[PDB]
Structures are given as C-alpha cells and as structure tokens.
Amino acid sequence: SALFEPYTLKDVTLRNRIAIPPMCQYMAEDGMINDWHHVHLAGLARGGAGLLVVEATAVAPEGRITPGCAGIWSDAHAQAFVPVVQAIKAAGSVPGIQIAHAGRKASANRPWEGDDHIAADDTRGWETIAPSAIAFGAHLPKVPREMTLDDIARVKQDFVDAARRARDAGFEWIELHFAHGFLGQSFFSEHSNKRTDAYGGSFDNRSRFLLETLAAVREVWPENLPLTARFGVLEYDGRDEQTLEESIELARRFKAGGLDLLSVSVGFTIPDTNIPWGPAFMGPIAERVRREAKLPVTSAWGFGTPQLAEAALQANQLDLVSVGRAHLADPHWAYFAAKELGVEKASWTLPAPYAHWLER
Amino acid sequence: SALFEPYTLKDVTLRNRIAIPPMCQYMAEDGMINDWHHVHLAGLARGGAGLLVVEATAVAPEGRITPGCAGIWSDAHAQAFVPVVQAIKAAGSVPGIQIAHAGRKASANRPWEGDDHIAADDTRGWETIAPSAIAFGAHLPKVPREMTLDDIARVKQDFVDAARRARDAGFEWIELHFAHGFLGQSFFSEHSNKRTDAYGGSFDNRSRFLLETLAAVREVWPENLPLTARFGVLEYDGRDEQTLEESIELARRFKAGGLDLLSVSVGFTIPDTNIPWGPAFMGPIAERVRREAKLPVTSAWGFGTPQLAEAALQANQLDLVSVGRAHLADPHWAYFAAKELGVEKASWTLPAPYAHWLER
Ligand SMILES: Cc1cc2c(cc1C)N(C[C@H](O)[C@H](O)[C@H](O)COP(=O)(O)O)c1[nH]c(=O)[nH]c(=O)c1N2
Ligand SMILES: Cc1cc2c(cc1C)N(C[C@H](O)[C@H](O)[C@H](O)COP(=O)(O)O)c1[nH]c(=O)[nH]c(=O)c1N2
Ligand SMILES: O=c1ccc2cccc(O)c2o1
Ligand SMILES: O=c1ccc2cccc(O)c2o1
C-alpha cells in the first residue's frame, strides 16, 4: 500500500504517509499547554500516524486565535512541550509543530462558545494586528490595527524565536502557518493588504513578509529537519486562475528559499467565497502545485476514507495525506486504514500492548 | 438507548452502561506504572465510557502475572496512580481498579514474549504460591509452593492494604480478582485446591479464602463506593451444572457480605476445557447468576458490537456491558456505539474539542 510506505525528507523518516495535520484544541491557558494536550497528542502518536503536527501555536500573545490557543512566545511556554515531544517520539511518530499568528482573525471565541470576535468589554479580548486596517467581516467584524514597520520586524523576530524554541524543545518538523486568512495569508492577499510601502502593492511586496519570515526562520531551524509551510493557494472568490498562478510563483520562491514541503490549502481570507467542499476536493490543486513548483506537498479535507488517501498517493497528487477529523473520531485511524487496505500484520500499526490482541 | 442510560450504585453514578474491563498492559517496571498507563487510561476515559477499571494490579510482587504487571504493594506504587485517577475523573469517567494475585499462573512471560512460565535461570522469575502444589500444566508447568496458614493471613492482609491504597489514591470502584485461574479462583476450584485444612475439602472451606478476603477488604473500603469482584462461575470442564450451582451459592454469600456487583467470567483454572467462544456467549450465564443470586452483574467477550451490547441490557442479562478489545482498537468506541445506535448528539459522548467538529 502506498499509504504505508515510509517517507524521508532531509534527515527525518516517517514510518508511513499518514500525517495528522495541526488541529487547535482550545484547551491552553495563557498559551500554556497542559495534560489535555499531552494525552491527546501522545494518544494520536500511538495510533500509528507517521507525522503528528501540533496545532497552531502562537508566536505572540495577540497572535492566538482564541483565549484557549497554545503559545510558544516564552521559554516557559516551550518547556511545556518537552514531555509531549518526548512522548510522541517514544511512540515512533515524528513530532512537528505549526507556528502561527492569527492576524485579523485573532481575539475570537472558541468555536463552541460563539466562534466570533470577542466583545469589546470582555476581559479576555485584545487588539488585533494586520497589514491593513480592514475587517474580515461577518462574525469577525473587528477592525485590526495597521502594522508599523517595527511591528513587522517584531513579528518576524517572534517567528524566529518560536522556531528556535521549537527546535530546542525537540521538534523534528516545523510548519509556518501562512494559510487560512491569518497574518501571513493576509499579507499575500490583495483583499486584505492595501499597503503602499515595501510590504504591499506588487506581487514582490505582498510576498515579502512571507519570504522574509521564511528566511529568518531558516537561520535558526536546522538544515537537516524539514522546514515546511501551510499556504492557501486560492480563495474560490472568482479570481482563482490569477490567484493560483501567483501562489504557484510564491511556492517556487519558497522552494528556492529552502522550503522542503508545502501544505496546500485554501485562503479563507474573506467570507464572500464559494468553496466546493467535497471528499479530497483539494487533490487536483495540490497536484498542480506539486507539478508546477516541483515541491512535495500534502493537503487535507475528506481524506479519512482509506481508499481515497491511497488513490491520492498513487496518482502522485500528494506525498503525505493529512487526516484530521477522522483522528478526533478514532485516535487509531491509522490502524483502521491498515485493516481497510489489507496491509499485512495491520494490528502492528499499533504498539504491542494493543497489537498482540488485535491480530486477526 | 439502554446502553446510554446512567447507572447508580452506592454513591457512584456512571454516565452510561459501557464499562472498560481490566486489561493488562504489561508495561510496568517493578510494579510501577508510567506514562504508558497514564496516556492509555486518560485517553480511554475521554472516549466516553462510564466506568474504566484499571488492569489487574498485584497486591504483592509474587502475585504479578508477569514482570510487566502493575502493582500496588507499597505506598509508592499507590501514589503513581494518583495523577491517572485524577485524569480519569477530569474526563467524567469513574475510575476503578482490579486488585489481584496471580497464584500459580504468576511468573510468566508477557503474551508477545512467549506467554509461558519464565525459565528457572531467568533473573526475572520467582516462586509461585497456590493452595496446593499442583501445576496448571501446558505452557504453565511450574509447580507452585503450597501456602501456609501464615501465607494465607499475609495475602489477605496484602488485599486489605491494596484496597486501602486504592481508596486513598482516589479510586471510586474496586474489583477483587477472583477469576481466571489466579489465586482466588484456585482456592475455589477442586481442580487446584486439594487442601485438607480449613481452606479446602468442602464448599465452605474452598469458599473461605474468598469470603474472608472480601470481609477483610470491606473493613477498609468505603461503604459508599462499589465493592465488586470478578469470578469464574464455570470452567467448561464437563462439570458445569454442579460448578454453576456452587458458584451461584458463593455469589449469594458475596452479596450477603456486601458485594455490590459481580463481574461474571469463566474459571480458566485448568487447560483441558472446551469453552464455546462466540459473540456475547456469556450472556445467558450472566443472566442466570443475576437472577438466582439477585445481584447486579457485568460480563464480557464479544460485546463490542453496539447492537449486541444494547440487546444484552434490554434483556436484563447484564447491568453494565464490558467492552475490552474494541477499546484497544478504538479508544473512542463509546462514540462509535452512540452513532451506531442513533443516540441524539452522539458526538457529545466525547469532550468539546472533539465533539464540536464531529457533530453531523
Ligand atoms: C478541530 C480542528 C482544529 C483545526 C483544524 C481543523 C479542525 C477539525 N484545522 C484544519 C485541519 O488541519 C484540516 O485541514 C481540516 O480539518 C480538513 O481535514 P479533515 O477533513 O478533517 O481530515 C487547522 N488547520 C491549521 O492549519 N491549523 C490548525 O491549528 C487548525 N485547527
Ligand atoms: C489485553 C488484555 C488484557 C487483559 C484482558 C484481556 C485483554 C484483551 N482480560 C480480559 C478482558 O477483561 C475481557 O474479559 C476480554 O478481553 C473479553 O472482552 P472483549 O471481547 O475483549 O470485549 C483481563 N481480565 C481481567 O480480569 N484482568 C485483566 O487485567 C485482564 N487483562
Ligand atoms: O488554521 C486553522 C485554525 C483553526 C481551525 C478550525 C477549524 C477549521 C480550520 O480550517 C481551522 O484552521
Ligand atoms: O485476568 C486476566 C489477565 C490477563 C489476561 C490476558 C488475556 C486474556 C485474559 O482473560 C486475561 O485475563
């Protein structure tokens, strides 16, 4: 089975092609993770996936999505990850982390607590920052503060510090969160970036924050560990071919700047879009990016059907298949997939105290 | 759905009728549990089951099954359980523990490391104890040492100390392991107990170790927390009706001695048997014990098919359904069962960081 073939990138070898993508848990306190995250992540690692990427982890307090978001903006925050990293490694999975800044979509309620921008008089909320003072709209009506050049310098340095901390905590894989309408994506998109300085107003200028952040992170992140990013390559906003062309050009510049793999997503930059949700709907666009930028890719959305994951790999649409919600439903999805694809000794996807008893 | 109806026993309320029975992990070191057990148990608790019973935990070092078995024979061993108990409670499950002594089946290899008695010159092995110096046979050929009266007194006190420690660690449910051919079962069975003192040679004498241990434990175990036992009620050895009659009589004496619920199993006392394995095969015998001893019961083996669990409850064969291997396969089996039975808001079997996203 293609799904169960190992994958090597730089000095890291994944035991199969199943990746667990970053999935916010909304369970941290002042950015500090706790036993929610420890058990959640260690349990997923034991389920058999080759790569486990920790949820969007804020590089700065105002870059959290919500008051429950994880952070890595101090050394104390980083040290909270150390036992979790060690547990993921003990289980034979590769520990990764997505480092992030929510930009204009920050200061929001948890998804089951309204999912909307926090009220002005709520003691939990904060001022958001972005390339331009323009609200997302809809359920995120807060107008962000326009960043100064010093703010740009500071946020870049926060990404550097976050990457340094991730490295020293023992992560073996890093993902820069340049997708989903958050800070990086919003610098790239003309919808959200109306700047007329060096950071807006041409393709090179809109790309600049992302490319400078990548290059700065590359200085502290080991060359032998995968350096990756998540990026929304289209919006489904009626400007798809032009946007895809620009995104693919940026992907080529990421590759040239040392990016090892791209997690291909949708922008979610603005609310007025028409995204054609469906099982594996991103497959063809991930394949196009892979081919035209000549870069390994992953993608997600509806790949939790084992045969569909297998088909995407065999078609060379993807190098790794990211499976999110199916792992919330069943932490041992990789074992389910091994059985469903007829892999020999499928139960040994799991550790011995489980595998021995499940051999059928 | 019957499966998702709460259950109250003494002061404890279970959120549903799904019990996770004790399942040895073989991952402890010198009896001390570790992060294997922490993550395993906390993950299961979050999966939605109403009751989680920790694996057979030895009351004394020689009462382990294997060198990987958990123990509770010192206060340091007990304190290792405290964070796990707290994690199980945080998840809304009830923490229980099975306290045990393997008797003549002790000093064995892990199941994936031979499953047989440890060789005489292996530094990990030890002398086994039992009511009589008679080997199980087959893969367990070691002849145990015949217990003295002082050994009987000592082992009873070890059960008392284990129960006291379980109480003080915060467990809310205890199960005495009087099944599966281990020490207690072997005192009851004429196959293994050939004693001619007060502890063998009539029904009352063979029952004596079990009843005295129950009564001694009852002195330290809170009256407001369920006091339970697992007991093999037949062997499938060609003596089933006589054995069932005696076992039911003993169950009546357990009830009279304060037992709140009986986990009904098979003896496994000797190897030469013909057990009719099949899905829910224990249902009718559990029902007979329940009716004839007028005592709540659980049982296991093949109840991991949701409709079958539901049928057993609706037929009043069982009060709780124990589901073991299906939870090794999928820690979130309770969520799978809720979906499969059409329970309203099935995803909310799981905590919010999962449930919100799985609402269909
Ligand atoms: C609970 C939860 C939380 C998050 C997500 C999703 C879900 C369900 N997703 C998106 C996720 O990585 C994935 O792309 C989608 O869930 C689609 O994949 P599935 O269809 O779920 O396999 C996500 N994406 C991201 O880049 N960073 C994150 O931290 C989050 N947080
Ligand atoms: C890995 C493992 C380990 C154990 C068990 C089983 C398995 C699979 N079983 C028996 C278990 O509680 C249950 O009765 C059987 O597994 C049958 O139920 P299922 O068919 O698996 O749902 C078990 N029983 C017991 O009384 N104490 C224990 O510690 C163990 N250990
Ligand atoms: O990047 C993110 C962060 C949180 C999140 C939550 C749900 C769906 C998503 O796609 C998400 O994406
Ligand atoms: O009581 C026990 C202890 C370990 C064990 C293992 C497998 C099957 C069983 O029934 C078991 O029973």
Short mmCIF file of N, CA, C and O in Angstrom, two decimals, chain A residues 17 73 96 326:
data_model
loop_
_atom_site.label_atom_id
_atom_site.label_comp_id
_atom_site.label_asym_id
_atom_site.label_seq_id
_atom_site.Cartn_x
_atom_site.Cartn_y
_atom_site.Cartn_z
N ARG A 17 2.76 7.34 5.25
CA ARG A 17 2.39 8.59 4.61
C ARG A 17 1.20 9.27 5.27
O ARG A 17 0.64 10.21 4.71
N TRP A 73 5.62 31.75 22.98
CA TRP A 73 6.23 33.08 22.98
C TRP A 73 7.16 33.35 24.15
O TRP A 73 7.63 34.47 24.29
N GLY A 96 5.96 17.27 14.99
CA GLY A 96 6.03 18.56 14.34
C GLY A 96 5.21 19.60 15.07
O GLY A 96 4.40 19.28 15.94
N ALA A 326 -11.03 12.54 11.19
CA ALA A 326 -11.14 11.10 11.42
C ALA A 326 -10.30 10.66 12.63
O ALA A 326 -10.65 9.66 13.27
#
